Amino acid sequence: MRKILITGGAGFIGSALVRYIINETSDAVVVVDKLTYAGNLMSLAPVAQSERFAFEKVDICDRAELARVFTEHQPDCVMHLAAESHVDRSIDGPAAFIETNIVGTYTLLEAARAYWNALTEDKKSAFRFHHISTDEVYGDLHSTDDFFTETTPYAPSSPYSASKASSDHLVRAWLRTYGLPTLITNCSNNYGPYHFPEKLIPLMILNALAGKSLPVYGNGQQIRDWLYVEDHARALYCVATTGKVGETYNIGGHNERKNLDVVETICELLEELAPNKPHGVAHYRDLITFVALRYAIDASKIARELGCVPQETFESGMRKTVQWYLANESWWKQVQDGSYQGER
Ligand X SMILES: NC(=O)c1ccc[n+]([C@@H]2O[C@H](COP(=O)([O-])OP(=O)(O)OC[C@H]3O[C@@H](n4cnc5c(N)ncnc54)[C@H](O)[C@@H]3O)[C@@H](O)[C@H]2O)c1
Residues near ligand X (CB under 6 A): 7-8, 10-14, 33-36, 38-39, 59-61, 81-85, 100, 104, 132, 134, 164, 187, 189-190
Q: How far apart are CA 200 and CA 1, in angstroms?
A: 38
Which CB sits closer to ligand X, 253 or 287? 253
Which does residue 165 touch among ligand X, a copy of itself, none (CB within 5 to 8 A, set by kind)? a copy of itself
Residue from 2, 52, 68, 172 touching a copy of itself (CB under 8 A): that is: 172
Is 134 annotated as ligand-binding? yes
Is 154 a binding residue for a copy of itself by CB under 8 A? The answer is yes
Q: How far apart are CA 315 and CA 339, in angstroms?
A: 32
Q: Is residue 20 annotated as part of the catalytic site, yes or no?
A: no
- The CA angle 189-53-15, to the nearest 5 degrees, is 15
Which CB sits closer to a copy of itself, 109 or 216? 109
How many CB atoms sit inside 10 A of residue 27's CB?
Answer: 18
* Active-site hit among 27, 56, 135, 225: 135
Reduced to 3 states, what is the DSSP secondary structure of residue 189? strand
Which does residue 280 touch among ligand X, a copy of itself, none (CB within 5 to 8 A, set by kind)? none
Buried b or exposed e, range 148-175, using 16+ CB within 10 angstroms? bebebeeebeeebbbbbbbbbebbbebb
Reduced to 3 states, what is the DSSP secondary structure of residue 53? strand
- For strands 128-134 and 77-80, give the pairing: parallel
Subset of 55-114 contacting a copy of itself (CB under 8 A): 63-64, 89-95, 98, 102-103, 106-107, 110
Closest by Cα among 189, 199, 193 to 253: 189
Subset of 271-300 contacting a copy of itself (CB under 8 A): none
Q: Is 251 exposed, middle or buried (0-12, 13-18, 19+ CB in 10 A)?
A: buried
Given a contact cutoff of 8 angstroms between Cβ atoms, the answer to whether 36 and 82 are in contact is no
Is 60 annotated as ligand-binding? yes
Give the annotated binding-site residues for NAD(+).
Answer: 12-13, 33-36, 59-60, 81-85, 100, 160-164, 190
Report the catalytic residues. 135-136, 160
Q: Which residues bind a copy of itself (CB under 8 A)?
A: 63-64, 89-95, 98, 102-103, 106-107, 110, 151, 153-159, 161-162, 165-166, 169-170, 172-174, 176-177
